[PDB]
Design a protein around this nucleic acid. Structure first.
Lengths: 108, 97, 81, 132, 94, 96, 81, 108, 94
DNA sequence: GCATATGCTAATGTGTGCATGTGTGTGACTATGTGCGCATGCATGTGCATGTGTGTGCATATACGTGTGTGCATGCATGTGCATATATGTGTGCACGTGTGTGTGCATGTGTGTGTATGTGTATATATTAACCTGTGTGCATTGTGTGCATATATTAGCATGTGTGCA
DNA sequence: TGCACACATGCTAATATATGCACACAATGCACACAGGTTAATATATACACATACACACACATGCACACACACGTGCACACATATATGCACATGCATGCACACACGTATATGCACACACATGCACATGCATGCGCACATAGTCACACACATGCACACATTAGCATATGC
């Protein structure tokens, strides 16, 4: 045989193409799975993970932290309009809420 | 003696509790509440420690989101104090009725 | 385990309202909030226990709660699902 | 200027209408009271018809009388349908020209006079004593 | 036994966008929860898309349509580009 | 001439339209609106007649349910007249 | 098709929808707000329906495409297949 | 061999047990489908159909109508507490709404 | 071609509860949508239940649990009784 | 005796100054934030190893391109008449301001129930192994189901009556 | 109480929609035969419940008063109800393109089975970012004090009514 190359490396991805293919096969989604379907899905999952991690890392850097905690993920998701829509019915544990006081409640 | 005017320290608590992420209900009384409610479904029920924590995290998130909606109803009625009818309206609009 | 709903104390409900941005709270909120939380917990725990029966287990796991919450449109992150 | 002679002509005609209508000056004051609410005494009407009142007062009572003479012509039937106190107060003077309200209340209770009456009389006493 | 998760792949992505930033175990669990959630949504929508069209296989075309249905405006456009670029690069190298 | 008090004819219309089931938006203007919105996604699209009917059934049901929620918000503010802020609050609470 | 067809949703038509919703009194600014809300709702449904149509390689939007789009948004509709 | 009789008659049902099995098998739900699963599912579908139809037939009779129309289905569902919960996010075409006027709007 | 629907089976159910009541074509379409919607909800929940428990078979036990999760309280109790009775009769007869 | 003219002085009024009240611009008081120093436990890197993804042919069936015929959606043209738009008058609901009671927030003192750590016994969730019953697969017989047509019912459209509510 | 307006009701024709029927056919059932998923019994490690202990921070109750909510009243213009002219939606047909669906041959691609490495997860330290707490700067509160603006009241001028004097 030739040297075994992972499909993720072939597609230039960090997420596991082979695992996604197996999960699609055993997830009872269809009786057949195309060759490019796990590659496309793994790339999309990797892109979305990078979007959140980049925003959460910026939030962690703002609070003078070197480690991302659930609070930074919550700040990243809720301050991003498109991520907030995607995760609008999702609760993040230990994430808290966004600081928001209605202007009518502020003293005059 | 020094006395803060009404609503001054209430606003301080809003800023304090919107900055933090810890659970606001005491863990032990909430665990007793969870087990009491589960008695009506089964007897001799055991709970994983993370199962009760998951229930508390969802419960507090649900209540905080409800209070945000309740606050908007009170402000809509030109008030600053939430009332039971504000909660009832928010749940009715949400479909939780 | 009798009358544990009063374990959700007045200061605990006030802290939850503060995180929600509430500045002033009427005295009748606390009993109304306890009834709301009681209804919410019954719905989640009933489904979570139902998942436990199907698995033939006697221990409610974190996944059972997560699946119960997901079924109600209240997906929770950070507990294995 | 000519307001003087215009008032005088109005007053002469006013006397003529009053005499023609068969109304006494006290009756004129009563009619003014029941048609405006500011009842005037017959001395004011006398000093008017004789042109004794001051110029500002002259102008002030011109409009009321104008309205009465211009209105009453229609129908008439429905429209028709002490020295010892003085001496005591003078005795109270020559010793304390300007008493306090604390003493004023005692003075009022002593001589049975109203507080406002005694206060205004005290003020006018001071006024006429400061004239000279 | 072995419990598979996405933690090691999430960590690799984190080092790409933030080489000096770590992640807590609780935050890693949330990221693992997020990946499984999005996977189930896309795969579920793609599964229905094949059923609506009387198809028995899920292909990259079904994944592309599911991504557009499930993702908001700019997220869908960029995710489609990453998915298309990976598929194009994949078949170029077999 | 006979004249009804303000709100008397409105109450009759509420009873009239809460009893019937027909579509309350004119069909042809709604069809033109659907095609104009769809032209922003694809050019030269065609619609089945029942496809537009399904859109109108869902659109009117969505609007009627929103007005019911909007009416509750107006009554909550001790009013009887619905206002744009009533709609905004109802959509905010719904999650829109 | 045409342009500016949102005005085709007339004030009497919006009033009838409010009557079915039990609304007694309507402010004059409601009609413009209602038109914006309807356009946002239709844009979301039609965009998904066309996406279903595009995947099927069709040029005609069918009732099923609208039904699937409505189901996708949590607004399942009965009576069209 | 023997005279073929449907599994619906075996289970005493009117809904098609055999068709539910095929819909389960080809619906991509699991690798295998048990024998009792389509029977159980068909009976539940038949019971729910009977519950709505008997309530809708009562609504039609209340309106002096012999034919069930979408209005009668909507009246049956919305007037039943449990069926309204089951179909809470469901829109019935040509069903209308329940007659409901807030008491504050009624004449004084 | 042939289009498959539940119309004939809904009609037989109607003739038992209301022997002298008909149904309109629009109302029959709604009933067909209702049956398909409930079928997909139950089958989807049963499918997830098998995956959660590392099972590859949908059995009546998965269907019964899915019914309890999806139907409201008293509706679920009668539905479970109907399903159990049919499976018992089906097994007793074959 | 009543009705006018006088002398004369209570009473107000112009005009005003103080006194009181309200609003705005800051000492003391409190609480959040910012480094600084230090231990903890939790994240991270390092190896076993094993299970899973991969490379390889292999056979199989789905999907796809091609052509086909047909429904059907689009566009047009015509007609009535229903609904829409405009304007007019007006009632009444919205909003504004006022005031008042009391409910709620703030702060204090006290104790008690929570949180943390510790340990233990027990129930139990988990994994292994054998076997067997159930589901799949295959092919054949065939009966039920959907399509396409008749058929007749219920539904819908008018016209006088019959309340039934509103409104002055 | 009576009038005017709107919805309803028994009533008759009309029709289009539902109901029932007959036929092919595709899907269901029947009968094997196979095999693997599932069950069951066992053992094992897990982690949950139970008890015990401590210290202390939070919860509870009280007292105080501030200001928010609720009722009240006012006025105004906004929106309802109405009438009238009219635009246009609805229905109705007619024609044609044209897209959708069926049907089919068939290659491309996916599953299958198997050997085999290697990537991933569990376990193992390890050190380092987070938490914890002390002191100190620092933004904020508000309360307090001061200054300004505004009414009665009174300093003196006007005003108007009383008692008695004249007069018709």
């Amino acid at each position: 045989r030739a040297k075994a190359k992972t499909r993720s490396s072939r597609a230039g991805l960090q997420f596991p193409v082979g695992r996604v293919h197996r999960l699609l096969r055993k997830g009872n989604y269809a009786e057949r799975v195309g060759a490019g379907a796990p590659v496309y899905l793994a790339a999309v999952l990797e892109y979305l993970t990078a979007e959140i991690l980049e925003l959460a890392g910026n939030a962690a850097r703002d609070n003078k932290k070197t480690r991302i905690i659930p609070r930074h993920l919550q700040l990243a998701v809720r301050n991003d309009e498109e991520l907030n829509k995607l995760l609008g019915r999702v609760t993040i544990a230990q994430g808290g809420v966004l600081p928001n006081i209605q202007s009518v409640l502020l003293p005059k | 003696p020094h006395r803060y005017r009404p609503g001054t320290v209430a606003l301080r608590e809003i800023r304090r509790y919107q900055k933090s992420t810890e659970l606001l209900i005491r863990k032990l009384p909430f665990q007793r509440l969870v087990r009491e409610i589960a008695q009506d479904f089964k007897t001799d029920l055991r709970f994983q420690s993370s199962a009760v924590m998951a229930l508390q995290e969802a419960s507090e998130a649900y209540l905080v989101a409800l209070f945000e909606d309740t606050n908007l109803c009170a402000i809509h009625a030109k008030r600053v104090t939430i009332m039971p009818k504000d909660i009832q309206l928010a749940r009715r609009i949400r479909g939780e009725r | 385990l009798r009358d544990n709903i009063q374990g959700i104390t007045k200061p605990a409900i006030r802290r939850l309202a503060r995180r929600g941005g509430v500045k002033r709270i009427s005295g009748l909120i606390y009993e109304e909030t306890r009834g709301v939380l009681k209804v919410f917990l019954e719905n989640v725990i009933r489904d979570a226990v139902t998942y436990t029966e199907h698995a033939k287990r006697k221990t409610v796991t974190a996944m059972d709660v997560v699946y119960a919450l997901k079924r109600q449109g209240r997906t929770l992150y950070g507990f294995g699902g | 200027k000519a307001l003087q002679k215009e008032l005088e002509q109005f007053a002469k005609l006013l006397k003529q209408k009053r005499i023609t209508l068969g109304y006494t000056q006290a009756d004129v004051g009563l009619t003014l009271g029941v048609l405006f609410g500011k009842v005037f005494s017959q001395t004011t009407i006398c000093r008017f018809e004789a042109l004794q009142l001051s110029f500002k007062n002259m102008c002030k009572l011109r409009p009321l009388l104008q309205k009465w003479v211009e209105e009453a012509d229609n129908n008439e039937n429905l429209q028709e349908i002490e020295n010892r106190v003085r001496g005591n107060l003078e005795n109270l003077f020559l010793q304390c020209p300007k008493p306090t309200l604390q003493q004023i209340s005692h003075i009022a209770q002593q001589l049975g006079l109203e507080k406002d009456v005694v206060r205004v009389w005290f003020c006018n006493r001071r006024q006429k004593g400061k004239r000279s | 036994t072995r419990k598979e998760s996405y933690a090691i792949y999430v960590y690799k992505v984190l080092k790409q966008v933030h080489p000096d930033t770590g992640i807590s175990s609780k935050a890693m669990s949330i990221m693992n929860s997020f990946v499984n959630d999005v996977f189930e949504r896309i795969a579920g929508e793609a599964s229905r898309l094949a059923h609506y069209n009387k198809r028995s296989t899920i292909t990259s075309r079904e994944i592309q349509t599911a991504v557009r249905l499930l993702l908001p405006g700019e997220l869908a456009k960029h995710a489609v580009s990453e998915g298309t670029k990976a598929v194009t690069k994949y078949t170029s190298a077999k």
